[PDB]
Amino acid sequence: NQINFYKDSYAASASKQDFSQDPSKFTEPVV
């Protein structure tokens, strides 16, 4: 699904695959 034919890693598709997230940084910033 990626048509990145350029030689730079920044010029790829918009990576909408960072599904992992840590809400405890802002919701529960204790101990």
């Binding site: 599904f19 992992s20 840590d22 919701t27």
Partner: protein, 295 residues
Amino acid sequence: IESIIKTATDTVKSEINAELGVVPSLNAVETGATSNTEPEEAIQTRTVINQHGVSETLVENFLSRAALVSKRSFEYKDHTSSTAQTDKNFFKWTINTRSFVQLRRKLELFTYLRFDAEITILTTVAVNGSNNNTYVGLPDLTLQAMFVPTGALTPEKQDSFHWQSGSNASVFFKISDPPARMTIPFMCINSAYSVFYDGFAGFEKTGLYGINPADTIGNLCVRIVNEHQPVGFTVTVRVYMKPKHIKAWAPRPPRTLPYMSIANANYKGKERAPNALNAIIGNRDSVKTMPHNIV
């Protein structure tokens, strides 16, 4: 921590949990946000499997919407005849997010963002009516868009001999064409773009406040390649930047007041509510008076 969640979390069945000694709902605000989930207390929930969309509310999905950052309707004519600081067939747009308040608010949601700027330059032509010229067709001008870093000398003319581009990045795209889908990289000497900068750019005391020297990407000098036509056109170059490869840090209060200046975050709200200085939210008639009520 270690949450790799892709869908919304399912709620479990809750029963009558009337237990002495511990309580979920009475939390402490004065640490942070609360941990009282739905089946813990305050409701007797049902086990519902939650398959709702979380990919659409990803921060990359939030921020890789290509929105406008500079709309310059510079006048394309024989500027030589009569022009003073009138965009002589070229403008040296210093690359700032802050010109248009939609994407400015989207990037000022966060203190820090490492991203690659997918810059799409959509250029539209309009024949200027001040000289009462006819339509005579919309020409297919090849329009050079040279991105110069800071320290490089910006051009001063249309044929300024700084458009040679021996090392400067430039695209040469016509108007009767798809727009210039170009990606300017993470052009920051720091590890993020400090969208907010509580500091001064220079080491001197008279430096301008809020402009990060790391976030000076440079100028996007956009010019007309071919020479001046006898009929004047109003070339409107709209550069749209899609924050791609999004890594965001420290989410912030969104800007509620209307924006005032690009260089700083100076504020003045509307003359009454909503979005005013003394009243961000539009006022109701009373505290117990309820608006938008079905009766």
